[PDB]
């Protein structure tokens, strides 16, 4: 009526925006956290053959 | 005015934007995850093919 | 005062009631209705009269189902207005309107003294 | 083919009310809910009250 959507709609963008942006943070960071681990991995496994 | 959609418009609405947020926290957990673990059978075989 | 779907467009003075209760039929008991009658009724061509009209504020979670809500107005009486939730685009709207509204009074005594001379 | 189709033919109304209740009111989950099961010829009789 007067003001209530002062309060509900800037919840629901604020919501929108943060559940979204968390989507993508998410995403990002296991990407990353795959290519980091996975260059352990290869590391390791090359040092293993190289004193092989 | 009308008590009861003032009362539960919101509820409904965080509850179902948790739920859309619920499907798309498994959905980027599931693909991400996925991507770890293909990633590390990529990265495995060609470290494995360089120094065989 | 309110309260990605909101909608807005003229809505006939007297067939106010008509309109809130098949809103209260097609939202299912959910609703969030305000409007206020227009002061200083308007002209039309339709029925080419001084008429009565009044416009609607409504929300709600809806996406797709706008199309029949804005669809079913225009059938019967709306008029497309892409507003803002807040006051802040107020100022541009008031602006955007301004531009026009400056001039828009010409036309008439313009076109008067032609005709007449 | 009758004995088959009569438990759906009554499951499908039995859904739509109970999404139809949920969104029309009150809280997401569950609310009491029940069958009538009346003999006939009392139809507005019934309906009124």
Redesign the interface.
């Known amino acids: 009526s007067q003001k209530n959507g002062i309060a509900?709609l800037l919840?629901?963008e604020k919501?929108?925006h943060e559940?979204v942006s968390?989507?993508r943070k998410?995403?990002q960071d296991?990407?990353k956290?795959?290519?980091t681990?996975?260059a352990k991995?290869?590391d390791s496994?090359?040092i293993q053959?190289?004193k092989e | 005015?009308?008590p009861?959609?003032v009362n539960?418009?919101?509820?409904?609405?965080?509850?179902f934007?948790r739920k859309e947020?619920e499907e798309?926290?498994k959905e980027?957990?599931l693909?991400?995850?996925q991507?770890?673990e293909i990633?590390?059978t990529?990265?495995?075989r060609?470290?494995?093919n360089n120094?065989? | 005062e309110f309260f990605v779907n909101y909608v807005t467009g003229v809505i006939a003075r007297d067939k106010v009631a008509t309109l809130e209760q098949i809103l209260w039929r097609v939202l299912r008991?959910?609703?969030?209705?305000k409007t206020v009658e227009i002061e200083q009724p308007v002209y039309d061509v339709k029925t080419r009269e001084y008429k009565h009209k009044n416009a609607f504020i409504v929300f709600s979670?809806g996406d797709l189902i706008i199309k029949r809500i804005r669809k079913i107005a225009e059938s019967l009486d709306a008029n497309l207005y892409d507003v803002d939730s807040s006051n802040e685009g107020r100022s541009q709207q008031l602006a955007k309107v301004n531009k026009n509204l400056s001039d828009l009074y010409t036309v008439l005594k313009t076109t008067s003294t032609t005709l007449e001379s | 083919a009758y004995v088959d189709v009569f438990i759906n033919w009554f499951h499908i109304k039995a859904l739509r009310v109970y999404v139809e209740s949920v969104l029309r009111?009150?809280?997401?989950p569950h609310f009491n809910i029940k069958i009538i099961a009346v003999p006939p010829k009392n139809l507005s009789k019934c309906k009124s009250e």
């Open positions: 509900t919840q629901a919501e929108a559940i968390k989507a998410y995403r296991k990407l956290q795959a290519k681990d996975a991995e290869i496994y090359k053959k190289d | 005015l009308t009861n959609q539960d418009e919101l509820n409904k609405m965080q509850a934007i947020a798309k926290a980027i957990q693909k991400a995850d991507e770890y990633e590390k990529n990265i495995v060609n470290e494995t120094i065989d | 008991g959910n609703l969030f209705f979670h | 009111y009150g809280l997401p």
